[PDB]
Symmetry: D2
């Protein structure tokens, strides 16, 4: 008895649609009984809330019909979707994301072996209860910490603060880590009855930064604003003033950082208590968006949003 | 005869203002005759165009009165100022930027040894003709490639695409590289008669991104917009449409990437020729701003702006 | 009340006698009641089996007299001593190692703040049951994965395969990981009655490698040989012949790699089952020696040695 | 017209006989007229002085018959062969080395695209006068700094101290660096009349290190010994005693480090002037051997060896 693995596709094929895959990568038949569905068909750069909501509901609904899920996803925004699923999926069976940095028609296309390794990962018993995983370049990465570090490299996906969970060699995984932050079925976040998510945008800080992007969001009634701060989540003066005001009138404000590794730490550079801001910790801006969006479905209180940022 | 080195301060002191430094770091007297001036006094997170213009003019004006310059600068935006100076400074004597990741009153403050090493660097003949340098954690980094990689680490400054120029051990530098792109006195950019710079902002791309930040900038008549794209400088649909429109009406649009290393490459993901967009290459968003600002003082033509992005 | 922390020194001071550490770093008083003892006084380059046996016995014996230990240790061999203790210490209270890349009298000496952070770590209840820890440059690292990456950098100590356990900001640790391999009280190794350890040596592979080093060890009767192989543990032919013969006549032979990251994997390059060799996995040559010495106190059978390499 | 590129093979094929490479990768035809020759056929683990001498003579002799060379070579010792040729080849036409981390029959085999990119590099006029190059994973690396960082990763090859020379995107190279140390036609080393090279061996340091390996080399009459030291080239006491004595009685002794990045610096840990030792700087043990072998063809004097280590 081979496990049953479902492949959910969100866009194009990564090994050169969706039931051609066993013909494209025959070696899959030796490790799993694979079924494919095309859930949506969208470029990863146009990824949106509604695809997220659809994916989390499909997985939650089909959890009992299958032994594990592999999701094919483009690489641009993989890190955002993976973290969203890591917080909202209530199946504790393996959920594994995979993509390809080189097109399937290129010489030395990475997608076939990536796909193989993702199925291997989803079929391994040891992969359960680790949260949502990304499998790229022979490495098993957790959905919270994983990000893309290079624009074109096949090795781009890394867990830049806390490292990978395991490495795969000839079909076996050497797991030496598991994430400590709460995920999947240990979260309070439940999207089964939601058709939309709170509105959260992102503004960038840099020298002589304009406050107009932040104003535009505030005027549109955004529920939350994440700042991609400079250094340890600092803000250009004018952006600071716009966001301090917005926080007093009830917009949730999260300080993150444009710096690619390390925590934006609480009350270090900025008195968060006083302005009602939240510090993102190791969550980069786009990940901090995901968590703020979910937090805002439970509460609008900054001090409770801070506690959520400290636990998930 | 020791060289004469001028220290230009832009904010607080990094070794625990500005003529206390020889009392704070006595070992400086053995390597140089140091003079200090406080040029401005601003936190690095509030760095702006007018401080840039002031610094470039002071250096250009005092070039003949001194043997090299060390500029003390906070770390948040060091990478932006360093690149601006690298394009606008016409002195080919050493210009060395330095800062500290830990406050001067902390245990194991990094600023004293950083300062020492920066003076060593500015005093060494071998440092001339390398463009503007950043000296942090015993390493000599070029102003184009240097960026901050971690929020709090003392080792945060790295040249993430092409590497450092030299390493410093016991007061000697082992230089094995020099930057190939044109800098300082080989650029056409001259700011001696400018009192302001063209207006360039930055917008971030992410899943379900709002086009309101980009619209706000367009409506304000910004000269240029830099996109912090996803992957190889891709854009969320709605942001794409707003920027394509703005490009046809004459706003300069530069595609960069929120991904921390690697080039945003020309005509790969997006038909730049067709929409009149420019690809940033290895320039991250905040560096791409600096170069676009300068480019816009010579030309508004996208194809000529592309050539500038390929040469500096 | 504050915890009681014992500092065991093995060498010279890393801040400022071991009983005056509280005078060098008076801030140690606010976080713990500190007692120091000098266990030995040697340079870390001269570290040896007799120091290791002393250290482990001392910790095992005094485990109940204290809330946690901090060991000051030279950087050259920290990574070897830390993995030895990680396998032999039967105390589940925090054991934390710490050193300094810069001499204590130098400008921007790193030791004081490293010492402080080590005591913070040893005092935190959360630090217990994680194995023996190395704290350097604001980072908590497990003793199995930690290694030195750079000859001189203060940020040298990294866990290159699996990452750090936590980061320290303002006296608080954000732990997001714990090691999965068995350590401390869960190992079978007990050194309380040992006065010496099996003789294990290391040979290097390279182009045109001499077999004389390997022969010299075999003729001297060494119990075990660790090969620092090329690539994925591969061996130059002369070295391979010598070691094949040694393994057939009773020497334990472990294939590791000179390459600084990744696993030397089992039956990939070399037929381990045929020759009776053992693959080190992610243990580098110096750490593979440590585990091989200990394995040899329990068994001389290669299959069982391999399993020990797969669990510890 | 297209350039003529010669591919010299040293082993098995990395894509798909060496005369059929144009059938394995037919896209090679659009960028060059390719000729292949099999110079030897061995595993890179078995690389030896006689192959090196053959390769360099062959390149020196055929320099005028071709526009550039590509050498296919196993990954285990690439970094040694590349630095040897970088010092001995007197052709200033492009010499490019290339291999594959995955077997040519495996899924997502890296060789074909690496081969293609190697030919692109050898054909680019800009690639000339940069020394011997390694092209792997879309990156052009100089033969002096390049090393393998990971046992299995396709992205393993990095220039860990000073960075890559350029990146390849869509058949175009963006070169931003060139090596400063002297190479190729600017070196004094000439192997055209040599049939053998001086005997240079490597010993490893670690806790409780045996001196037997070092004694075995000295008793066999080795011309030179490279110490893979701990930290900044430091030595275990027994190893230090043996090597001190060897150096006094005519053996050349170079201190390198087992630590994978940074310089082993001159008179810091060890008094080199007193013992007659030479510090390797940034050359790792296997590369220090290469330079030491060649230095010994010109001099046996330590001060002059040190200067050679400071220029090449």
């Amino acid at each position: 008895h081979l496990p049953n693995i479902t492949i959910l596709a969100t866009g194009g094929t990564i090994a050169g649609g969706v039931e051609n895959l066993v013909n494209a990568v025959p070696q899959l038949k030796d490790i799993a009984n694979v079924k494919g569905e095309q859930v949506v068909n969208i470029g990863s750069q146009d990824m949106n809330d509604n695809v997220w909501l659809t994916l989390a509901k499909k997985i939650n609904t089909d959890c009992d019909k299958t032994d594990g899920f592999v999701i094919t996803h483009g690489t641009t925004t993989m890190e955002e979707t993976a973290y969203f699923l890591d917080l909202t999926v209530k199946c504790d069976k393996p959920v594994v994301m995979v993509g390809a940095m080189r097109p399937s028609t290129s010489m030395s296309a990475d997608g076939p072996f990536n796909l193989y390794n993702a199925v291997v990962t989803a079929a391994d018993k040891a992969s359960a209860n680790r949260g949502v995983l990304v499998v790229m370049n022979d490495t098993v990465l957790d959905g919270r910490d994983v990000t893309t570090t290079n624009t074109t490299d096949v090795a781009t996906f890394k867990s830049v603060n806390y490292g990978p969970l395991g490495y795969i060699h000839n079909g076996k995984i050497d797991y030496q880590r598991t994430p400590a932050r709460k995920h999947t079925s240990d979260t309070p976040f439940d999207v089964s009855k939601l058709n939309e998510l709170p509105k959260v945008g992102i503004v960038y800080n840099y020298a002589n930064a304009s406050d107009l992007p932040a104003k535009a969001l505030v005027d549109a009634g955004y529920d939350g604003i994440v700042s991609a701060g400079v250094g340890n989540g600092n803000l250009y003066k004018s952006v600071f003033d716009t966001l301090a005001t917005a926080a007093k009138t009830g917009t949730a404000v999260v300080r993150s950082s444009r710096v690619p590794t390390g925590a934006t730490t609480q009350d270090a550079e900025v008195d968060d208590a006083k302005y009602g801001f939240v510090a993102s910790g190791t969550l980069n801006p786009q990940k901090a968006r995901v968590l703020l969006q979910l937090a805002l479905t439970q509460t609008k209180d900054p001090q409770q949003i801070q506690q959520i940022f400290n636990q998930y």
